[PDB]
Enzyme design. Structure first.
Site, mmCIF file in Angstrom:
data_model
loop_
_atom_site.group_PDB
_atom_site.id
_atom_site.type_symbol
_atom_site.label_atom_id
_atom_site.label_comp_id
_atom_site.label_asym_id
_atom_site.label_seq_id
_atom_site.Cartn_x
_atom_site.Cartn_y
_atom_site.Cartn_z
ATOM 1 N N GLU A 11 0.794 -1.230 0.000
ATOM 2 C CA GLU A 11 0.000 0.000 0.000
ATOM 3 C C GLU A 11 0.805 1.247 0.000
ATOM 4 O OE1 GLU A 11 -3.044 0.047 -0.683
ATOM 5 O OE2 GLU A 11 -3.827 -1.838 -0.084
ATOM 6 N N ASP A 20 -6.137 6.859 -5.235
ATOM 7 C CA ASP A 20 -5.713 5.477 -5.386
ATOM 8 C C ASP A 20 -5.696 4.989 -6.854
ATOM 9 O OD1 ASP A 20 -8.243 4.651 -5.848
ATOM 10 O OD2 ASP A 20 -8.397 3.340 -4.175
#
Ligand SMILES: [Cl-]
Ligand SMILES: [Cl-]
Ligand SMILES: [Kr]
Length: 162
Positions: A11, A20
């Site tokens: 991540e 994202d």
């Protein structure tokens, strides 16, 4: 290696609001803030999550706190899910980490639909599970991450992460 280092690799860590891979507002270690296209909205959810006026920036400690909460929530979601729990309970520790990563990424709902892969996994048919998991939008969209997680599931080792 463990779950935390595992997801911290996949991540990353960013202290400023960012979008994202799907274009949604996120912060920290993969903490999704909102699916809304409004930064304001995102900033609002950020402030609500932190407990202060962040102005879209958090500290490291703050990011790690959100991360602990999210991993915790992912595990509990698994245990509370009737399709997931039995799978989870049948696995060894490494493979459990792989299933936690997928839930963190896709949500319980999303993962509970890999019905076919879940059954092979429960049956300990690793290679078969692995091929079935790759037949997914998940894999076509984020192939490098998907491959690390799938290898983990398949072999039960942390090799993809070294
Ligand atoms: Cl929160
Ligand atoms: Cl990826
Ligand atoms: Kr699965």
């Amino acid at each position: 290696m463990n779950i935390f280092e595992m997801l911290r690799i996949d991540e990353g860590l960013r202290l400023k609001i960012y979008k994202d891979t799907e274009g949604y507002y996120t912060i920290g270690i993969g903490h999704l803030l909102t699916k809304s296209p409004s930064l304001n909205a995102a900033k609002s959810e950020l402030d609500k999550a932190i407990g202060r006026n962040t102005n879209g920036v958090i500290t490291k400690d703050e990011a790690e706190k959100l991360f602990n909460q999210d991993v915790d929530a992912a595990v509990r979601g698994i245990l509370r899910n009737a399709k997931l729990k039995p799978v989870y309970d049948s696995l060894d520790a490494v493979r459990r980490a792989a299933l936690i990563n997928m839930v963190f990424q896709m949500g319980e709902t999303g993962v509970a639909g890999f019905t076919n892969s879940l059954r092979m996994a429960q049956q300990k048919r690793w290679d078969e599970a692995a091929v079935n998991l790759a037949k997914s939008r998940w894999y076509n969209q984020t192939p490098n991450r998907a491959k690390r997680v799938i290898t983990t599931f398949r072999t039960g080792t942390w090799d993809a992460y070294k």
